[PDB]
Design a protein around this ligand. Structure first.
Ligand SMILES: COc1ccc([C@@H]2N[C@@H](C(=O)O)Cc3c2[nH]c2ccccc32)cc1CN1CCN(c2ccccc2F)CC1
Ligand SMILES: COc1ccc([C@@H]2N[C@@H](C(=O)O)Cc3c2[nH]c2ccccc32)cc1CN1CCN(c2ccccc2F)CC1
Ligand SMILES: [Ca+2]
Ligand SMILES: [Ca+2]
Ligand SMILES: [Ca+2]
Ligand SMILES: [Ca+2]
Ligand SMILES: [Ca+2]
Ligand SMILES: [Ca+2]
Ligand SMILES: [Ca+2]
Ligand SMILES: [Ca+2]
Ligand SMILES: [Ca+2]
Ligand SMILES: [Ca+2]
Lengths: 619, 619
C-alpha cells in the first residue's frame, strides 16, 4: 500500500533499524525486498561469525610444528587443537559462506556504491587476505589477525563502539604523555635518592630498572615488595613511597579516568546525535512520500489515513469517527507527532501467528495471559529453589538420597520446556522473542533439551554438572527486589547493564584475542628447563600457560584483572632475555587497563546515573 | 564605624568566615572582639593539635610492658617510643593547653549556650576522658582513641567532611547488604561446584573457607592463585571464575562506586547549600544594621556611604562624584549586589604594613612587582634545575666533582630566602600569605634556613639528602604546561586537587590511626618462633611490622593500597588461630576501600568535571 510504505517506515523510526537507501523504486518497496531476506541470512551468518572467530582458539599452534617433542604436556597445553587436514575444510567453509555475505550488499547497493564504500572495501580486503592464506595453507602469520579484525567490524555494535574509541583516543595519548612524564620524573628522583644506599641492588640497572619498578608500583601490584630493602635500611624510606603511591594512585591514576569519562561522555553524545539524524532520515523519508504536492505539509484527509494504518498495523491509540473532524475544530511536526505516538499510544501489537482455528488454542491463550499464570511459574521456581538446595546439599553430605531429588529436578526442566512451548504458542515467536528475558529462557530451555537427548542416549557427574547450573533460569526472581525502593536503581541498572556492557565487554575481549595471537607467535617455548625454574616458582604455577591460545586467553585475563600481573611480565622478560618483551605487557596495560577498563567504569556509572534521573522523572 | 561594621562584614561574606553570634552589642563589635583574638590562639593551637595527634606514634607500646625481652629487635619495631616519665609531661602540657582552647568558646558564647551546644559538650567530654587517663597514668586502653577523636573534630574541614559521610552512610549499608548477598550466593554456587573435585582442599572448611576465598577473589588480590588447583583439574573450571570476576569487578564493584558518587554528590550539594544560607546569614546581618527604619530597604544617601567604605576598605571599583546621582537617574537585592561586586569589582586590597618611611623601600617595591622580576626568579630556577641535575648526576658517577656544584646549590637556597625576604617585605605578610603558592615557599624556605643553622652548627649525606629534596620549590614550573590548551584542565584540576583532597585524605588517614591503635592492642606478639615462620615466608618479609604503631601505620597503608593485602589477614588469622581476627581486615576493607577510597575518586572526577565547565564558561 502506498500509504503503508510510510506507517511501516514510521515503526522503523520507533524501532530504530538502520539502512541507507534513499529511493526504493512486510512489504514496502524494491530495495527493501533486496535487503529484507538478509534477516534469515543474518541469523545464519550469526553462527558463522561466532565459529569463524573461534577457529583461532581451536587452531593448532605454530611453535609445535618444528622441534621437538610433538603434542606433549611439555610446554603445556590443554585444548583439542587442530589437524590441518581437518582445519582447511572449516577455512574453506567459513570463507565461502562469508564471501556470500560480504558481497551480498551489492544486492541492495549500487555496484560502484558497494566498491566505493569504505566499509565494504575493507570488508572485501580482509576477505581477500583470508583467501590467500587458505590457498597457501592448502599446498599463517597474520591469518588469525584478520579473523578478529573481520569479526570486530562484522557486527555494528562492536563497530560503532570502536568508532567511539577513536574520537577519545587522541586526548588519551596526551594524558599518557603526562603520565609518562610523571613516571619519568618520579623514576628519576627515586633513583638518585637510592644510589648511595642499600637499595642499589634494586636500582642496580639504575633508571632503566627503577623506572620499570616505579611503573609497577604505580599499579601497586608490588607495593610492599618493591621497596622492602629500602624500608629495611631506613624507616623514613617509606615516607617517599607513601608519598608517591598517594599521588600516583589517588591523584594521577584517578584524574586519568576523569579524562576518559568526559571524552567518552562526549563521543557517546556524538553517536546518539548522529543516530537521531539517521533515525529522522527515515521519518522525513516516510513523510516525504505522503506529501505528494511538495508544499511541505499534509492535509487532513491525507493524514487521517496515515493514522488509520498506524492505529491498525502497529499500535493501539484510538478509533476514527465522524467525531474525527470534531476534534480538529508540516514536515518537522509530523516526526514529533509519531515520536509522541511512540511513547504513549505505542504498544507494538502482535504480528500474525496460520490457516488454523483459534478454537482449541483459544482456551490456553487467555488462561496463560492471566496474572495467575505468572504467579504459578513463580511458585514453581520457588519450589524449584528449595528443591535444588536439597539435591546439592545431599552431594556434600554424600548421602545416596541425592538421587530421588535430582530426578525430580529433571521433571522441573520439563515444566520449563512446557512453559517455553506453551508461552511461545500463546504469544507468537516474535512477541516471545521481543522481550529480553524470554529470548534468554528459550535458549537456556534449549540447552536443557539438548542435554536431555544427549544425557539419555549417551550412557551423577554426567548429569549433576550439566543440569544444576541451569538453575540460572531461576535468576529472574531477583526482579523481586526492585519492589524495594532502595535496591530498585541498583538492580534495574544491573539488568540494563548486562546487555549494554556486552558490546564493550566484547570489544575488550577481542583485544585479548589479538594480543593472544601475538603471545603465541612470540612466546612459543617455555631454555625450557633451567630458565623456567629460575624465572618463577610460586609464579611458575602461574606461568603454566601462554604456550597455548586458550592458556594465553586465560592468562591475559589474569593480566586483565591485574592480579600479580608483573610475574608474567618479569618472567617472559628473562625467558626471552631482553627488556623489549615487557613492552607487550606495557602495551597491554596502557591499551586495556588505562583505557578500556577505565571506559567501562564510566559507562556503568553513567548508566546508573541515567537510571537515577529516570526513576526521578516518573515521579 | 557604624557603617564599617557592615562593609567588613560584607567582605566576611565574600571571604566566607563562619561564626554564629547574632548580636554583637579590624574593629567591629563586642562579641567579635571576644573571638577576634582567637586567631593567634588558633595559630598556636595548630601546633598543639598536630603534636597531640602524634603523641600516639611516639607513644610507648603496650605489649612490651610485660614479658619478655624488653626493647629488642625481637617482635620488631623502629621508632623512639617513649618513657612514661618523659610521656606525662606532654600529656599534661598538651592537655592543659587544650583545655584553655576547648573552654575558650564561652568567651564569645553564652554560659548555657556553650554547655548546651552538642559540639562543645562532646569536646569537653573527650576533654574529661583524657584527664582521667593522665591522672591514672601518673600514679591506657582507650587513651589514644580520644586523641584522634578529639583531633577529627578539632578542625572544621575534617568535621564537615565526617558529616558529609553520615548522610551517604545509610545507603552504603544497603548496598553492602546486596554486596554481601552476592558474595553469599556466589560462595554457595562455587562450593557445591567443587565439593566432588580436587579443589576440596581449598574448599575443605567448605562455605566458611570458600566465602573467605571468593571474598578475596572479589578483590582480585589472589586471582590466579585462588583457583589454580581447579584450573589444574579441568580447563573449563576457569570459565566460572572469569564469569565471577567479570560480574564481581566490572558489574558489582563498579556500580558500588556509582552509589557513593551520587550519594556524595547529593550530600556535597547539601553542604554548600547550608554554607550559602550561613553565608547569607552574615550578609542579611550587615544589611539589617544599615536599614535602621526596618522598612526593608535602604536610601541612596544611606547606601552611597556603604559603597564608599566598600571601595576604600576592601576592593577597587570606582570613584564617587556628583555624577553619582547622575548614574542613578531591598534586603535580598543588596546581597546579590555585593556578590556581584565580589566577582568583578572585588580584588582584596593590601592591609597595612608601620611608623616608617616608604622612601628607601619604595625602590625595591616597584621593581619587584614588575613582570621582569617574575621572569628573573623563573630563570633562576631553570639554571637551578640544570644545576641540581649535575650535582645528583655526579653522585651516581661518584666523582668528587659533585662537591663544587653542591655548594653552589646552597647559594641557590640563599637566593630563595632572599626572594622570600624581599617578597614578604614588598607585599606584606598577609598578602604574601593570601596566595597558596607563597605560603608553601615560605614554609619550605624556612625548612632550608633551619637546615642551614643545623647543618653548619652540627659538624655529603649530612647535606645531600636534607637539601636536594627541596628542589620541590622548583615545582611551580609545572604551571607552564597550563599554557598548552590540552594539559590545562589536567594540571589546573591537579593543582586545585592537592588542597581540596587534603581534608578527605586526612580523614581516611585518621581511620588508619584508630585502626592502628586497635592492631597494636590486639596484635602485640609476633608462638613468635614457630607460627611466624610457618604462617608467612615471602610475606613474613611483609609481616615484619604491625608490632609497632608506625610499623602498623605503614602496613595499613599496604592494606590501603591493597597490594598483597590478604597475606596480612590470612597470617594474623593463624597467628591468633581464630577466624574472627580477619574481621579487623574485613572491617577495614569495607570501611575504607569500598567507602572512603571510592569517595575520593568521585571527588577527583567531579573536581575535574567542574574544571571542565569552568574553562568552558570563560569562552
Ligand atoms: C631513554 O633514554 C633517556 C635517558 C635519560 C633521559 C633523561 N635523563 C635523566 C637524568 O639525567 O636525570 C632522566 C630524565 C631525562 N629527562 C627528564 C625530564 C624530566 C625528569 C627526568 C628526566 C632521557 C632519555 C630519553 N631520550 C632517549 C630515549 N627517548 C625516548 C624513548 C622512548 C620513548 C620516547 C622517547 F622520547 C628520547 C630521549
Ligand atoms: C553463617 O551461618 C549461615 C550458614 C548458612 C546459611 C545458608 N546456607 C547455605 C546453603 O544451604 O546453601 C548458603 C546460603 C544460606 N542462605 C542463602 C541465601 C542465598 C544464597 C545462598 C544462601 C546462612 C547462614 C547465616 N545464618 C547464620 C548467620 N547469620 C548471620 C551472620 C552474620 C551476619 C549476618 C547474619 F544474618 C544469620 C543466618
Ligand atoms: Ca591455517
Ligand atoms: Ca650520597
Ligand atoms: Ca500535502
Ligand atoms: Ca566431601
Ligand atoms: Ca594461570
Ligand atoms: Ca599514657
Ligand atoms: Ca558430584
Ligand atoms: Ca532605610
Ligand atoms: Ca653506584
Ligand atoms: Ca612491610
Amino acid at each position: 500500500q502506498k500509504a503503508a510504505a510510510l506507517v511501516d517506515l514510521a515503526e522503523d523510526g520507533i524501532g530504530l533499524p538502520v539502512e541507507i537507501l534513499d529511493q526504493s523504486s512486510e512489504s514496502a518497496r524494491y530495495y527493501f525486498i533486496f535487503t529484507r531476506l538478509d534477516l534469515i541470512w543474518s541469523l545464519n551468518y550469526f553462527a558463522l561469525l561466532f565459529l569463524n572467530f573461534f577457529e583461532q582458539p581451536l587452531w593448532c599452534e605454530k611453535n609445535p610444528k618444528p622441534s621437538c617433542k610433538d603434542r606433549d604436556y611439555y610446554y603445556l597445553g590443554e585444548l583439542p587443537y587442530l589437524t590441518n587436514a581437518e582445519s582447511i575444510i572449516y577455512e574453506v567453509i567459513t570463507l565461502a559462506i562469508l564471501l556470500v555475505h560480504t558481497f551480498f550488499p551489492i544486492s541492495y547497493e549500487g555496484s560502484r556504491i558497494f566498491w566505493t564504500s569504505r566499509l565494504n572495501l575493507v570488508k572485501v580486503a580482509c576477505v581477500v587476505i583470508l583467501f590467500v592464506d587458505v590457498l597457501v595453507d592448502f599446498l599463517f602469520r597474520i591469518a588469525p589477525y584478520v579473523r578478529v579484525i573481520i569479526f570486530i567490524l562484522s557486527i555494528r555494535e562492536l563497530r560503532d563502539t570502536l568508532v567511539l574509541l577513536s574520537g577519545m583516543l587522541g586526548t588519551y595519548l596526551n594524558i599518557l604523555a603526562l603520565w609518562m612524564l610523571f613516571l619519568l620524573f618520579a623514576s628519576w628522583i627515586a633513583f638518585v635518592m637510592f644510589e648511595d644506599t642499600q637499595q642499589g641492588l634494586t636500582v642496580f640497572t639504575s633508571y632503566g630498572a627503577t623506572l620499570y619498578q616505579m611503573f609497577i608500583l604505580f599499579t601497586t601490584s608490588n607495593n610492599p615488595d618493591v621497596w622492602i630493602p629500602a624500608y629495611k635500611s631506613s624507616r623514613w624510606s617509606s615516607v617517599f613511597f607513601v608519598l608517591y603511591v598517594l599521588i600516583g594512585v589517588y591523584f594521577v591514576t584517578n584524574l586519568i579516568l576523569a579524562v576518559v569519562y568526559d571524552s567518552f561522555k562526549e563521543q557517546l553524545a556524538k553517536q546518539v546525535s548522529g543516530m537521531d539524524q539517521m533515525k529522522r532520515r527515515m521519518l522525513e523519508k516516510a513523510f516525504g512520500l505522503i506529501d505528494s504536492d511538495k508544499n511541505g505539509e499534509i492535509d487532513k484527509n491525507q493524514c487521517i489515513k496515515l493514522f488509520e494504518q498506524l492505529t491498525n498495523y502497529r499500535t493501539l491509540p484510538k478509533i476514527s469517527k465522524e467525531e474525527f473532524g470534531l476534534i480538529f475544530d508540516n514536515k518537522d511536526e509530523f516526526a514529533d507527532l509519531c515520536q509522541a505516538i511512540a511513547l504513549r499510544f505505542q504498544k507494538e501489537e502482535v504480528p500474525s501467528l496460520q490457516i488454523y482455528h483459534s478454537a482449541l488454542s483459544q482456551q490456553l491463550r487467555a488462561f496463560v495471559r492471566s496474572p495467575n499464570f505468572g504467579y504459578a511459574i513463580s511458585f514453581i521456581l520457588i519450589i524449584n529453589f528449595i528443591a535444588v538446595v536439597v539435591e546439592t546439599t545431599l552431594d556434600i553430605e554424600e548421602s545416596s538420597a541425592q538421587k530421588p531429588w535430582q530426578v525430580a529436578e529433571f521433571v522441573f526442566g520439563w515444566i520449563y520446556v512446557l512453559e517455553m512451548a506453551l508461552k511461545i504458542y500463546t504469544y507468537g515467536f516474535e512477541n516471545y522473542w521481543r522481550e529480553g528475558a524470554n529470548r534468554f529462557d528459550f535458549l537456556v530451555t534449549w540447552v536443557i533439551v539438548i542435554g536431555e537427548t544427549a544425557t539419555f542416549i549417551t550412557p551423577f557427574s554426567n548429569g549433576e554438572w550439566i543440569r544444576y547450573l541451569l538453575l540460572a533460569r531461576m535468576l529472574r526472581l531477583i526482579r523481586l527486589l526492585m519492589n524495594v525502593q532502595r535496591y530498585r536503581a541498583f538492580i534495574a541498572t544491573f539488568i540494563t547493564l548486562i546487555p549494554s556492557l556486552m558490546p564493550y565487554l566484547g570489544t575488550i575481549f577481542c583485544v585479548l584475542c589479538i594480543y593472544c595471537s601475538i603471545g603465541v607467535q612470540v612466546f612459543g617455548g617455555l631454555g625450557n628447563k633451567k630458565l623456567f625454574e629460575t624465572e618463577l616458582a610460586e609464579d611458575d604455577y602461574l606461568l603454566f600457560n601462554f604456550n597455548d591460545y586458550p592458556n594465553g586467553m586465560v592468562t591475559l585475563f589474569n593480566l586483565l584483572v591485574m592480579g600479580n600481573w608483573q610475574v608474567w611480565m618479569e618472567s617472559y622478560k628473562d625467558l626471552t632475555g631482553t627488556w623489549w618483551s615487557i613492552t607487550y605487557f606495557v602495551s597491554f596495560y596502557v591499551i586495556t587497563i588505562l583505557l578500556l577498563l577505565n571506559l567501562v567504569v564510566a559507562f556503568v556509572l553513567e548508566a546508573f546515573f541515567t537510571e537515577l534521573d529516570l526513576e526521578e522523572e516518573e515521579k
